[PDB]
Write a protein that binds this ligand. Sequence first.
Ligand code: ANP
Ligand code: MG
Length: 340
Amino acid sequence: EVKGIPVRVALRCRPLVSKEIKEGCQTCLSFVPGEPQVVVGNDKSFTYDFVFDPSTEQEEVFNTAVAPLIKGVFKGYNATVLAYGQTGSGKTYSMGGAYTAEQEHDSAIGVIPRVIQLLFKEINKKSDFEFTLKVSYLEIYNEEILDLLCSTQINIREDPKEGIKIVGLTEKTVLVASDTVSCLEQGNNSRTVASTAMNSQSSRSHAIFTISIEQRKKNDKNSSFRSKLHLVDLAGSERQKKTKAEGDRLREGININRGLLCLGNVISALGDDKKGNFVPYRDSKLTRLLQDSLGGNSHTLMIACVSPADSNLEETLNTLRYADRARKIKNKPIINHHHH
Ligand SMILES: Nc1ncnc2c1ncn2[C@@H]1O[C@H](COP(=O)(O)OP(=O)(O)NP(=O)(O)O)[C@@H](O)[C@H]1O
Ligand SMILES: [Mg+2]
């Protein structure tokens, strides 16, 4: 029995990568055809809302798991898609967190460029309605919020009558798909990325791409829906013994791991939520920004990314365990009406 509106979880297993083939890894994950199950270490089974094996292409991930969620923003809901998993697991790949214009029309494009396409397709169908879209794009780098659309210090202020405000963050008002994707491209070029042994293009920050959507009926300008879509490419857990990181790179890894610890503590707290519980959102900027997304006013999809390689079994088990806990989180999305 599942009561209410849980966080949904898609488990995505990428294929083996060159590093793993080089080191002689075997696959340690197996799948059960047509069932949303994965078997790990040929022994332990986990069930999710979706399971995508290594052959699953970007288009299928999007159409199966993401598109139905995005369509909910047109009913006036907030929604979040967040990718979570070890370094090198495929979060940025899945999300399109490194998309550039060079990738336009490549079937390898990920979630964010696909969301932008879909939003404008749906807007064009909804000829009886008018829309306002704005985008912001930030990263959380070594515990600071940096504006990725900014080629002063940004701070979180809690409004008493509902919600976080990110003071000093810029927004662009967009008109069509092309200028919306330009924002993604621009922010992606600013995202802090560096090499480690586990990923030559490791994300050194958590990135959040936000589209604010206002919808109103053309025959009635006073009433609207106003909601937000957050598209989140987290940084991933890493171990110095595998990354070989030193200096500033290792400091990034420490800050990343600490934040992900805070996220794990939030997920664990929410799994058994009840009256009088405490959930440690306040412990990190990341978990403050994800407060509505996890346990609050949002429809939320986690894309949990894993490597199939036996050398990563421990990390993969950690991701599977936390992704299993995330399914127990109950959200309370409402229709975000506004009247003027
Ligand atoms: N499903 C997939 N199919 C094929 N290649 C993949 C897939 N997922 C990831 N890759 C490749 O694996 C490498 C690492 O992916 P990436 O998405 O950068 O990892 P990440 O999870 O974002 N790591 P990090 O930012 O360090 O926490 C890249 O070269 C990707 O193109
Ligand atoms: Mg990444």
